[PDB]
Design an enzyme around this catalytic site. Structure first.
Site, PDB file in Angstrom:
ATOM      1  NE  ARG A 214      27.857   5.820  66.628  1.00 42.30           N
ATOM      2  CZ  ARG A 214      26.825   5.117  67.083  1.00 42.30           C
ATOM      3  NH1 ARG A 214      25.623   5.673  67.193  1.00 42.30           N
ATOM      4  NH2 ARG A 214      26.990   3.841  67.406  1.00 42.30           N
TER       5      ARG A 214
ATOM      6  CD  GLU B 240      24.558  -1.490  64.297  1.00 43.94           C
ATOM      7  OE1 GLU B 240      25.599  -0.828  64.177  1.00 43.94           O
ATOM      8  OE2 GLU B 240      23.498  -1.003  64.732  1.00 43.94           O
TER       9      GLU B 240
ATOM     10  NE  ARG C 238      19.611   7.224  66.123  1.00 45.34           N
ATOM     11  CZ  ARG C 238      20.597   6.332  66.202  1.00 45.34           C
ATOM     12  NH1 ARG C 238      21.453   6.124  65.206  1.00 45.34           N
ATOM     13  NH2 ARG C 238      20.749   5.668  67.332  1.00 45.34           N
TER      14      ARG C 238
ATOM     15  CE1 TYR D  64      24.430   3.553  64.229  1.00 47.02           C
ATOM     16  CE2 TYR D  64      22.663   2.157  63.376  1.00 47.02           C
ATOM     17  CZ  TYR D  64      23.635   2.424  64.331  1.00 47.02           C
ATOM     18  OH  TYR D  64      23.813   1.552  65.389  1.00 47.02           O
TER      19      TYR D  64
ATOM     20  CG  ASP E 245      18.710   2.760  70.533  1.00 44.55           C
ATOM     21  OD1 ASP E 245      18.753   3.424  69.464  1.00 44.55           O
ATOM     22  OD2 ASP E 245      19.702   2.422  71.200  1.00 44.55           O
TER      23      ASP E 245
ATOM     24  NE  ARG F  27      28.574  -0.492  66.763  1.00 45.11           N
ATOM     25  CZ  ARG F  27      27.564   0.177  67.321  1.00 45.11           C
ATOM     26  NH1 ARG F  27      26.452   0.395  66.636  1.00 45.11           N
ATOM     27  NH2 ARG F  27      27.662   0.629  68.568  1.00 45.11           N
TER      28      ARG F  27
HETATM   29  C1  LIG Z   1      21.489   4.646  71.059  1.00 44.86           C
HETATM   30  C2  LIG Z   1      21.727   4.095  69.838  1.00 44.86           C
HETATM   31  C3  LIG Z   1      21.758   2.583  69.530  1.00 44.86           C
HETATM   32  C4  LIG Z   1      22.231   2.070  68.163  1.00 44.86           C
HETATM   33  C5  LIG Z   1      23.477   2.889  67.824  1.00 44.86           C
HETATM   34  O1  LIG Z   1      23.335   3.989  67.239  1.00 44.86           O
HETATM   35  O2  LIG Z   1      24.599   2.460  68.183  1.00 44.86           O
HETATM   36  C6  LIG Z   1      21.155   2.283  67.062  1.00 44.86           C
HETATM   37  C7  LIG Z   1      20.325   1.028  66.748  1.00 44.86           C
HETATM   38  O3  LIG Z   1      19.015   1.409  66.333  1.00 44.86           O
HETATM   39  C8  LIG Z   1      20.216   0.109  67.962  1.00 44.86           C
HETATM   40  N1  LIG Z   1      19.434  -1.068  67.597  1.00 44.86           N
HETATM   41  C9  LIG Z   1      18.609  -1.657  68.462  1.00 44.86           C
HETATM   42  C10 LIG Z   1      17.832  -2.870  67.966  1.00 44.86           C
HETATM   43  O4  LIG Z   1      18.478  -1.288  69.632  1.00 44.86           O
HETATM   44  C11 LIG Z   1      21.609  -0.332  68.455  1.00 44.86           C
HETATM   45  C12 LIG Z   1      21.568  -0.780  69.936  1.00 44.86           C
HETATM   46  O5  LIG Z   1      20.707   0.058  70.689  1.00 44.86           O
HETATM   47  C13 LIG Z   1      22.929  -0.832  70.640  1.00 44.86           C
HETATM   48  O6  LIG Z   1      23.484   0.467  70.776  1.00 44.86           O
HETATM   49  C14 LIG Z   1      23.904  -1.727  69.911  1.00 44.86           C
HETATM   50  O7  LIG Z   1      24.874  -0.923  69.251  1.00 44.86           O
HETATM   51  O8  LIG Z   1      22.648   0.679  68.225  1.00 44.86           O
END
Ligand SMILES: C=CC[C@]1(C(=O)O)C[C@H](O)[C@@H](NC(C)=O)[C@H]([C@H](O)[C@H](O)CO)O1
Length: 679
Positions: free
Chosen positions: A593, A515, A213, A633, A238, A531
């Site tokens: 998404r 982000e 990912r 993403y 995550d 975002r």
């Molecule tokens: C379940 C997915 C979480 C993610 C997202 O896709 O929104 C991906 C990303 O890697 C993640 N980053 C971290 C550091 O945790 C964030 C986060 O988990 C929160 O979802 C914030 O969007 O978004």
């Protein structure tokens, strides 16, 4: 029933909702009585119908609507089967989301799928486009011979009470029905005839990770294209999991990629290929005591040709949602040092610091201890490296068992069983390379500037940006976001990466997932797209090299969700329609998404000065697939030829129904001609 092919049909066009009868085929009598077998078919769907049966056999009569077998696809790329003879007798199902596609480069394309019903092994297996998608084991094996009153064999739908249900629309290129169970190898080979785009990282490569990912893609000034991504071992969850950062490069314009490496990784938990459960219970389980790296950012300093890889560093059992509030640093003698807790001290007593040369000090006595750390943060007691047992993780039913093994690994301050433990908040780590990834420098934790009032300060995944012109030409910038005094933030360097300075871009304390990615304007000013927690992508501008930023303004015309998704926005080296251009990638749906699109924005000089000098006209939009196809993403890159490369997640990474899918990170390339709808 004879051995081998019972039926075969080629080039069958099916009008939406019409179906196609195979009842008069010579082998229909055998197909209607199959005890096991294999079905393989090539198809092209031209319909947006939700569920579309490709092939079915069952009872079409009144009151017998739950008596049938069918292989189907969904408008969102899912594929599966249903073997039924009313719920009280049996209802066997198997499926996997985001397994097929509908459109590629403007045209409907063929997908090749297969179902194998292996009586001898009492197992069912689904395949599509060269991949084994799912498996179902049943002690009471059943097949077509077990359905009551079968009276039809149909293509493009399932007959239910005399009506065509699950209506397909399109073409069945070819279908072959065998009474025998072909081997997995034969099916991988047969279905592999149709593939679109390519994989850089994949389940089975040397990373030993089944899941990936968070893509990063960047073309270097030398022409080499580099890439990175999270190597998520314990499913696609995550952090508060076991995740490493993978890296790979291409020296032929993105045609072939090198054997991936793991520049940022931890060894407290073993890296191994494991199939994470996708059932309603197991899918939610994640690794509890592992340290990890998550969300990569790649950047090149064109002056020195040096490259950098940044990522969030999560201590054992930590992720953004459970990180402790604090910087993780302590100030002594006016200098900030990483603080440590001796495992036998009070639960929140961080009475030590890592000072010059990695020597650990007792802060109370201000005297060096008998411990130190090297450039990797692994412990040493009197010059002897400390070690601890590596952990393994396996499911026992729905429970995830994390147990010590007999393997010894170097004791790291970020591990749960370390004698000296780091403060449980998140950190910002980086390594640099002057040889395009052949070797990387020691671990540099650059987050000493983390506000003491912040819960987390993390990176906006993708790529960073170096200012090419103006008074701040040469400055390096990386987008950040946090839960603190500000949401959007940045870290910049004027000494080619040796030192970094943190900048708060707003005063928002909500900690939404801001982000962002950065693009440069003709005069050196900057525009950052991000975002937000609202139903839009925001834009901010800086006229002082990223030191101060304007208020957020909604990016008009580009739809998104409330929770949002990471985006990729890049500068393009040549003008498009005679104007400076930027390119943006993001899913376009207002919920879920999906429906990924690539936009081309032309930079216009409004005639004003300051923050209002430039205006971007989002003139073109390019749909990557059909509206319901998953797209999360992504990261764009201008390849050495005129092309635009795209490394993206071809599934809905937010959906609780699409977790833990293998091989969804795809690499595709598009010309400006294609992107501008100019064919
Ligand atoms: C379940 C997915 C979480 C993610 C997202 O896709 O929104 C991906 C990303 O890697 C993640 N980053 C971290 C550091 O945790 C964030 C986060 O988990 C929160 O979802 C914030 O969007 O978004």
């Amino acid at each position: 029933i004879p051995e081998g092919i019972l039926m075969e049909k080629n080039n069958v066009d099916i009008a939406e909702g019409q179906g196609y009868s195979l009842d008069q085929e010579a082998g229909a009598k055998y197909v209607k009585a199959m005890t096991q077998g294999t079905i393989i078919l090539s198809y092209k769907s031209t319909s947006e119908n939700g569920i579309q049966s490709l092939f079915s056999v069952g009872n079409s009569t009144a009151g017998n609507q739950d008596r049938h077998f069918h292989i189907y696809i969904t408008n969102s790329g899912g594929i599966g089967i249903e073997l039924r003879n009313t719920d009280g007798v049996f209802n066997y199902t198997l499926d996997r989301p985001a397994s097929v596609r509908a459109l590629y480069k403007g045209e409907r394309v063929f997908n090749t799928v297969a179902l194998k019903a292996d009586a001898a092994n009492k197992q069912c297996r689904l395949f599509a486009n060269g991949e084994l998608l799912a498996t179902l084991d049943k002690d009471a094996f059943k097949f077509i011979s077990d359905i009551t009153g079968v009276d039809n064999v149909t293509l493009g739908g399932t007959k239910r009470q005399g009506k065509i249900a699950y209506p397909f629309g399109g073409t069945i290129g070819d279908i072959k029905v065998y009474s025998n169970a072909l081997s997995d190898e034969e099916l991988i080979q047969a279905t592999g005839v149709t593939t679109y785009g390519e994989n850089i990282f994949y389940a089975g490569d040397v990373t030993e990770s089944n899941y990936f990912r968070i893509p990063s893609l960047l073309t270097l000034s030398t022409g080499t294209v580099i890439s990175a991504a999270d190597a998520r071992y314990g499913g696609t969850h995550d952090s508060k999991s076991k995740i490493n950062i993978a890296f790979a490069k291409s020296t032929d314009g993105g045609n072939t990629w090198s054997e991936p490496t793991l520049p940022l990784k931890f060894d407290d938990y073993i890296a191994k290929n494991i199939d994470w459960p996708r059932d309603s219970v197991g899918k939610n389980v994640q690794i509890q005591g592992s340290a990890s790296y998550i969300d990569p950012v790649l950047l090149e300093d064109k002056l020195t040709k040096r490259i950098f890889l940044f990522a969030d560093l999560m201590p054992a059992g930590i992720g953004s949602s459970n990180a402790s509030v604090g910087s993780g640093f302590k100030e002594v003698n006016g200098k900030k040092y990483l603080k440590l807790r001796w495992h036998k001290d009070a639960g929140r007593a961080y009475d030590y610091t890592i000072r010059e040369k990695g020597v650990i000090y007792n802060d109370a006595t201000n005297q060096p201890t008998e411990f130190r750390v090297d450039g990797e943060y692994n412990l040493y007691q009197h010059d002897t490296n400390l070690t601890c047992k590596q952990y393994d993780y396996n499911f026992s039913g729905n429970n995830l068992i994390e147990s010590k093994t007999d393997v010894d690994v170097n004791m790291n301050i970020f591990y749960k069983n370390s004698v000296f433990k780091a403060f449980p908040t998140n950190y910002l780590a980086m390594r640099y390379s002057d040889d395009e990834g052949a070797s990387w420098s020691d671990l540099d934790i650059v987050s000493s500037f983390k506000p003491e009032v912040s819960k987390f300060l993390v990176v906006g995944p993708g790529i960073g940006k170096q200012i090419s012109t103006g008074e701040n030409a040469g400055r390096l910038l990386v987008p950040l976001y946090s839960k603190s005094s500000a949401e959007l933030g940045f870290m910049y360097s004027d000494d080619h990466g040796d030192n970094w300075t943190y900048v708060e871009a707003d005063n928002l304390t909500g900690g939404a997932t801001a982000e962002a990615q950065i693009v440069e304007m003709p005069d050196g000013s900057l525009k950052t797209y991000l975002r937000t927690g609202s139903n839009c992508i925001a834009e901010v501008t800086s006229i002082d090299g990223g030191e101060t930023w304007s208020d957020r303004v909604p990016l008009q015309g580009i739809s998104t969700t409330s929770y949002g998704t990471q985006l990729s926005v890049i500068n393009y080296s040549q003008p498009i329609d005679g104007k400076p251009a930027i390119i943006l990638s993001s899913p376009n749906a207002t919920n879920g998404r999906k429906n990924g699109k690539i936009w081309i924005g032309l930079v216009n000089d409004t005639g004003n000065t300051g923050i209002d000098k430039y205006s971007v006209e989002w003139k073109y939009s390019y749909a990557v697939d059909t509206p319901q196809m998953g797209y999360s993403y992504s990261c764009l890159a201008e390849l050495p030829d005129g092309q635009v490369g795209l490394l993206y997640e071809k599934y809905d990474s937010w959906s609780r129904n699409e977790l833990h899918l293998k091989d969804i990170l795809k690499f595709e390339k598009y010309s400006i001609s294609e992107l501008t709808g100019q064919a």
